[PDB]
Paper text:
Here we describe the first crystal structure of an enzymatically active HD‐GYP phosphodiesterase protein, PmGH from Persephonella marina EX‐H1, a thermophilic marine member of the Aquificales. PmGH comprises an HD‐GYP domain fused to a GAF domain. A remarkable feature of the structure of PmGH was the identification of a trinuclear Fe centre which is buried at the bottom of the cavity forming the c‐di‐GMP binding site.
Author numbering:
A (entry chain B): -2 to 360
B (entry chain A): 0 to 360
């Protein structure tokens, strides 16, 4: 006997999967699978409009490229332009249908149902199409209604995924740019600030941290030197090496960074503040500003020390050429359990190729 | 016709996917569940690590209601992770009939299931009440509610993630904007309030809600370029001479240089505000003497909000101006310092500005 709630439970499962999925590619796949099962259709496609190239596009299969579609032509094109629904009982009798794809593969397209996708402001942003009704000779008025509800859900999900990626990007950008507010008085580069978080992301990941903490270290580590904004110019701009009085002030960039960052409530800022105050501490207990030792330094500060020293060593600094991989490796092995956490150093060494790769393509 | 509940689900999940507010997500989910389970009432209880209680919200948008995490039906399900299916609440010893008493309600059937996060921990309880057959929730109803519960878990975890990100993003922008705090007196609350005034101004001038959210977050960064000003200028313990003042004026250009290496709309706007905020509608400002609409609307809105905040704060010998005095100054400056059209909008809403100033001292 059949389950009367079968499709309902199937739809709820798809909706759970989709709500969890941040990648637009897979959202599109899951929406397509959903349509096929709910519409009882053999094939389904989503076409979205590209502002720049002036084309609709679709992904044909799992993992394959964007196929551009002519928005001025065909069935999807009609629906995209007019906002009207096309329900084709026989594709081979509609001059808007192209048989070439059909001609090559042994596939026979019979029925086509295409509806527009609308954004929140009722603009047409694409088309949702289904092909070859399996359990009836034609798509019905009821099928049209159902596909329109699916379209609304698809629209919302697609926009949400895009809005979220826009936010994610803006958040990174802001952290990167503001972290480099020191650019006028300190020579550390914008790419340095980015790369340090990227190396620390690998370390946290390979060290087995939760995906949330991996993401936080990537964004928190770049802020470690923000405290330099409060250092006097006579110290920060001194064209050589510091006296005791001056060095003592320079060290306070850690304390200052902490003061700038600690007033947050977010985990991001609590971790960033700790990194700011910890990143010159040594596994030894011989670092600054407090001589914290071993596990007294949060794992985030320990990961940032390794990443930051790595990136400095692999850049040219006046009087000293950037070190190559081999020397950097020997250095880290020698400083294991001294400057750096011995467990994290091993992880870092084991992933040293990914480190140099980031360094090479982000100059 | 069995497609009825599918169209209902699809309507609710569309609204859920748009919703940025946890409270509203929860209301949608409970309305979804009432319709799909054909039950009269539903509730979602979530756990607060801090207070060690469950909580729930009721409709109309009232306060969070604290619920005892140990005793009760919800309490039982949260602690044990077991499903609870009650045919008659008034015969169950764990039922608290006081909710019925105050509301005029008579609870009959209760079905309550756990909500789990991805990590697999129990984070709450989904409860459905008064199946509309006036009879028991069935094994098939339990099974349906297990699927609804997984969908609720996912959308709730997603909405919480989204709120964490938004809050972290604001925190970052606010804290780093105040990185000037060792060397400049502009306060943390000032930096926040200026975006909040510009947010009301943008809304009331009819910008898209996305742009309104952008101005709230972009305006706060407009003085970041002060970090590039030499100490012999910024910390000079005497009035600046003309040459030093020309250097000080470059904090606009410096802010632009810090911010402009973006691709995001937020940074593109923030960079414009950094470079424009001392420009004057009549073209007599700095650094470039831009005039009227040559100044982006975002820069024009920030100049109004930043001056407002400064007129309404006390300094030694210089008492904050009151509403009447501030209004008069803005009318005088219409078409001079400020965009006449925006000033009108700002003046129509000045009570909202004073309320912000009073709420965040
Ligand atoms: Fe450094
Ligand atoms: Fe440092
Ligand atoms: Fe560094
Ligand atoms: Fe200022
Ligand atoms: Fe300024
Ligand atoms: Fe200001």
């Amino acid at each position: 006997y059949q389950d009367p709630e079968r499709k309902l439970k199937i739809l709820l499962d798809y909706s759970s999967k989709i709500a969890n999925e941040k990648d637009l590619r897979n959202v599109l796949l899951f929406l397509t699978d959903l349509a096929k099962e709910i519409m009882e259709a053999d094939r389904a496609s989503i076409f979205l409009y590209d502002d720049q190239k002036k084309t609709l596009w679709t992904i044909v299969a799992h993992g394959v490229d964007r196929i551009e579609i002519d928005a001025d032509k065909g069935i999807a094109g009609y629906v995209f332009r007019t906002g009207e629904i096309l329900n084709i009982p026989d594709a081979y009798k509609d001059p808007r249908f192209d048989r070439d794809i059909d001609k090559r593969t042994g596939y026979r397209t019979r029925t086509i149902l295409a509806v527009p996708l609308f954004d929140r402001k009722q603009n047409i942003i694409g088309v949702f199409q289904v092909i070859n009704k399996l359990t009836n000779s034609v798509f019905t008025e009821e099928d049209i209604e159902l596909l329109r509800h699916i379209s609304l859900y698809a629209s919302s999900t697609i926009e949400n995924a895009i809005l979220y990626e826009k936010l994610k990007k803006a958040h990174e950008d802001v952290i990167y740019r503001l972290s480099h507010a020191t650019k006028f008085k300190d020579p550390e580069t914008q790419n340095h600030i980015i790369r340090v978080g990227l190396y620390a992301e690998i370390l946290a990941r390979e060290a087995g941290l939760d995906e949330e903490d991996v993401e936080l270290v990537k964004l928190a580590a770049p802020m470690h030197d923000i405290g330099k904004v409060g250092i006097p110019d006579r110290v920060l701009l001194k064209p050589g090496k510091l006296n005791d009085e001056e060095w003592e002030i320079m060290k306070k960039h850690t304390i200052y960074g902490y003061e700038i960052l600690k007033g947050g409530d977010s985990r991001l800022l609590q971790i960033a503040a700790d990194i700011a105050i910890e990143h010159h501490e040594r596994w030894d207990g011989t670092g600054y500003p407090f001589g914290k030792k071993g596990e007294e330094i949060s794992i985030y500060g320990r990961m940032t020390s390794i990443s930051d020293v790595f990136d400095a060593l692999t850049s040219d600094r006046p009087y000293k050429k950037a070190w190559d991989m081999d020397r950097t490796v020997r250095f880290f092995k020698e400083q294991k359990g001294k400057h750096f956490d011995p467990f994290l150093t091993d992880i870092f060494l084991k992933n040293i190729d990914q480190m140099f790769s980031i360094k090479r393509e982000l100059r």
